[PDB]
From a paper:
Unbound myosin motors from the 120-ms data were analysed to produce an EM map with global resolution of 4.9 Å. This revealed that unbound myosin motors were in a primed state, vitrified before productive actin binding. The myosin models for unbound primed myosin-5 and primed actomyosin-5 are very similar (0.80 Å root mean squared deviation from global alignment of the motor domains across 708 Cα atom pairs) yet subtle changes are seen in the flexible regions, especially in the position of the converter domain and helix D. When the two structures are aligned on the main actin-binding interface (the HLH (residues 505–530) alone), the entire U50 is observed to be displaced with the largest shift in the position of helix D. This suggests that subtle structural changes in the myosin motor are induced by actin binding and propagated through the molecule. The movement of helix D results in the rearrangement of the position of Y175 and Y119. These residues interact with the adenosine ring of the nucleotide and the rearrangement probably results in less restraint on ADP in the nucleotide pocket.
Myosins are molecular motors that move or move along filamentous actin (F-actin).
Numbering used by the authors: 2 to 593, 598 to 599, 632 to 770, 775 to 778
């Protein structure tokens, strides 16, 4: 039947290597059996488009001009890939609209420009309205979640997704503002202020500049915002995920360490900071490696003022704040300690070194002991102790490991205190969860950190697909309702390759058991186990030190060096002991106790989170990066199309197009709509009673369908039944009155 639409003047989409899809118009009517189409391109040139001799499949028809730039993609006549790309291009380039709906899921595009599209009057304008009675915006999602939590008394979750830089961090912040405003009616409104204040604090400690993002979010965050019976904020709790430790000691060619170090170095001249004995960021190796200590459009000194102000608002006094700056200053002074070689396998550090002097002074430690333990290691046996001198390379490695460890304890200490400030005495009626996770990334060189983040992103896709596609269509099959299968790309195989008993993480952990274990040996074990036995896993022709894996977004090559070390993540017992013995109270609090590998800990942490998400009603936001140049309102078609297919956008709209998301059991429907039924319509069979009543209430049979155990409805029909229920109760009250 679709071939009847291929008439003279009809428009179609044809594949193009650079533009992905090109629009063309038919110069003649198509007849079944024709091998070439005479097309007029929009550039003024005529083309003979040859059809496939085996399949005879025609190019995609283009939707009418009235359907260009629609608020909801389900309004399109032809629901195919070229149509999606065109509709989003027009709304972005022409209309400057960043938002579009794909049913319940929201699509967000990064503008690379500040626009005033979120005044409190806008917040008020989105408040109190229906879905679609406002145009697409993040506030609509927030309001829908607010509306659902209040009516359903069910916890909700806001899940944002996308590759690095797509606007995801930005989206979560604005959603929180909406809830804080509505809740703002409270007496102890300071709690909402504290909740919003949490974000900039974590950004200072948690973010750093990458080539992808000037403010990359190098840890994960999940926030539960609790509500009372009044549907007003009671408090909150943050659960966070693995921070990039390698960032403290290393930075690439145009990257920085965490923002807070630069804020502290910018404030070195102030009298309060004088005790720290700091200089500019160029003086310390841990800050200098990147080659550029400043971010354009950012004033580190100004940010330092804001960060301090944020700390005081949470109730963190100046003594606490000066205490954290001391730790950070100490990490910088440790980074420039001079270490000299003795013979081939020994090292020595002088008790005279200027940087180690202030390090020992700030930490409240003995210089002579630190010189000894940076140069030697202890081996303890039941009967005796043995000492091994360390090489120059080992001394610097030992020093750096301690720096990562200190920074890690410090980050955790801060989040614990914000959670203490965010705590609530009252009982939780319900909650809204917000997820903010580092997005898919790739570089010239990729390591263990990229492996972990990509693996986490794979899990998010699995949760999304399980809920949206898998769980949902399986129900229709069991329900015995006419259903056409909707295809999706299932990533379960790569997930098994990573997580299963035979998986990559398990093999790395087994290599960690062996003292003889090596990255080379592990890579060889991966090749032996999977080189030609697996389709998701492959090795490049030129290398034996790296491997490539097929993720949902793209294939990624990972270098094997450092994987066992990074999986172990440990520090010498003597160094931790000298810090446990420190004179400064904060250091002993971290070093006091306030076997599984980082990879094992990471898997379970993600499992607990997946389980947590499954308990709530999800609300998904898909963020897209339009261009790599960071330019205002520029659209890259090749780059966009790959993100759309990776996100499964088209199939999400096709499943949405099938409709019937709402589903009442015959018992629930009967119990809720008994008032719309006359006593004569109530048969011994509840199922037949519901059929007879629904057939009387709704005349169009295309708006509802009957399954084995549930009744299915099209959009707006339950609201119509609620209007009828409300009208019947009102009429009954008037009759009684
Ligand atoms: N509302 C916005 N207005 C302007 N630029 C934005 C907006 N949202 C995101 N961006 C741009 O996208 C970049 C990355 O988005 P952000 O949410 O900050 O981090 P990410 O998207 O990586 O989570 C920002 O640095 C900024 O350049
Ligand atoms: Mg981010």
């Amino acid at each position: 039947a679709a071939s009847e639409l291929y008439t003279k003047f009809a428009r179609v989409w044809i594949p193009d290597p650079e533009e992905v899809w090109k629009s063309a118009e038919l110069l003649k009517d198509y007849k079944p059996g024709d091998k070439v189409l005479l097309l007029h391109l929009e550039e003024g040139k005529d083309l003979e488009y040859r059809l496939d001799p085996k399949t005879g499949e025609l190019p995609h028809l283009r939707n009418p001009d009235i359907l260009v730039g629609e608020n909801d993609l389900t309004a399109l006549s032809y629901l195919h890939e070229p149509a999606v790309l065109h509709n989003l291009r027009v709304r972005f380039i022409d209309s400057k609209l960043i938002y579009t709906y794909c049913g319940i899921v929201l699509v967000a595009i990064n503008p690379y420009e500040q626009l005033p599209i979120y005044g409190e009057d806008i917040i008020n304008a989105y408040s109190g309205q229906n879905m679609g009675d406002m145009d697409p915006h993040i506030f609509a999602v927030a309001e829908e979640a607010y509306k659902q939590m209040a009516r359903d008394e069910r916890n909700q979750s806001i899940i944002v997704s996308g590759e690095s830089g797509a606007g995801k961090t930005v989206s979560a912040k604005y959603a929180m503002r909406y809830f804080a405003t509505v809740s703002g009616s409270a007496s102890e409104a300071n709690v909402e202020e504290k909740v919003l204040a949490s974000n900039p604090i974590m950004e200072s400690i948690g973010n750093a500049k990458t080539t992808r993002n000037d403010n990359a979010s190098r840890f994960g965050k999940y926030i539960e915002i609790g509500f009372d019976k009044r549907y007003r904020i009671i408090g909150a709790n943050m659960r966070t995920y693995l921070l990039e430790k390698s960032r403290v000691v290393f930075q690439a060619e145009e990257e920085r360490n965490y923002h807070i170090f630069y804020q502290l170095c910018a404030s070195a001249k102030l009298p309060e900071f004088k005790m720290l004995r700091l200089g500019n960021a160029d003086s310390f190796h841990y800050t200098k490696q990147g080659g550029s200590p400043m971010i354009e459009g950012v004033d580190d000194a100004k940010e330092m003022a804001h960060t301090r102000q944020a700390c005081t608002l949470l109730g963190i006094s100046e003594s606490y704040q000066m205490g954290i700056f001391r730790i950070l200053a100490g990490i910088l002074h440790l980074g420039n300690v001079g270490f000299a070689s003795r013979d081939s396998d020994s090292c020595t550090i002088p008790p005279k070194h200027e940087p180690l002097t202030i390090f020992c002074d700030l930490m409240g430690v003995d210089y002579e002991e630190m010189c000894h333990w940076l140069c030697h290691r202890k081996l303890a046996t039941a009967t005796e102790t043995y000492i091994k001198p360390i090489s120059k390379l080992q001394a610097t490695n030992a020093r750096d490991a301690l720096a990562k460890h200190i920074y890690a304890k410090l980050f955790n200490w801060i989040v614990d205190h914000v959670n203490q400030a965010l705590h609530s005495a009252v009982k939780q009626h319900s909650f809204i969860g917000v997820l903010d996770i580092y997005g898919f990334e790739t570089f010239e060189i990729n390591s263990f950190e990229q492996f972990c983040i990509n693996y986490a992103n794979e899990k998010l896709q699995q949760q999304f697909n399980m809920h949206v596609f898998k769980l949902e269509q399986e129900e229709y099959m069991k329900e015995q309702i006419p259903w056409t299968l909707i295809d999706f790309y299932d990533n379960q195989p790569c997930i098994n390759l990573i997580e299963s008993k035979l998986g990559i993480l398990d093999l790395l952990d087994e290599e960690c058991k062996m003292p003889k274990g090596t990255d080379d040996t592990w890579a060889q074990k991966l090749y032996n186990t999977h080189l030609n036995k697996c389709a998701l896993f492959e090795k490049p022709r030129m290398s034996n030190k790296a491997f490539i894996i097929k993720h949902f977004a793209d294939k990624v090559e990972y270098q094997c060096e450092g994987f066992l070390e990074k999986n172990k993540d440990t520090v010498f017992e003597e160094q931790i002991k000298v810090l446990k013995s420190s004179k400064f109270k904060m250091l002993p609090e971290l070093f006091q106790a306030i076997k599984k590998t980082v990879g094992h800990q990471f898997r379970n942490s993600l499992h607990l989170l997946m389980e947590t998400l499954n308990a709530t009603t999800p609300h998904y936001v898909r963020c897209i990066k339009p261009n790599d140049f960071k330019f205002p309102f520029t659209f890259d078609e090749k780059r966009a199309v790959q993100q759309l297919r990776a996100c499964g956008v088209l199939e999400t709209i096709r499943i949405s197009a099938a409709g019937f998301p709402s589903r009442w059991t015959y018992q629930e429907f009967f119990s809720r709509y008994r008032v719309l039924m006359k006593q004569k319509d109530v048969l011994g069979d509840r199922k037949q009673t519901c059929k007879n009543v629904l057939e009387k209430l709704i005349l169009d049979k295309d708006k509802y369908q009957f399954g084995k155990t549930k009744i299915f409805f099209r959009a707006g029909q339950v609201a119509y039944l609620e209007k009828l229920r409300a009208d019947k109760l009102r009429a009954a009250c008037i009759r009684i009155q």
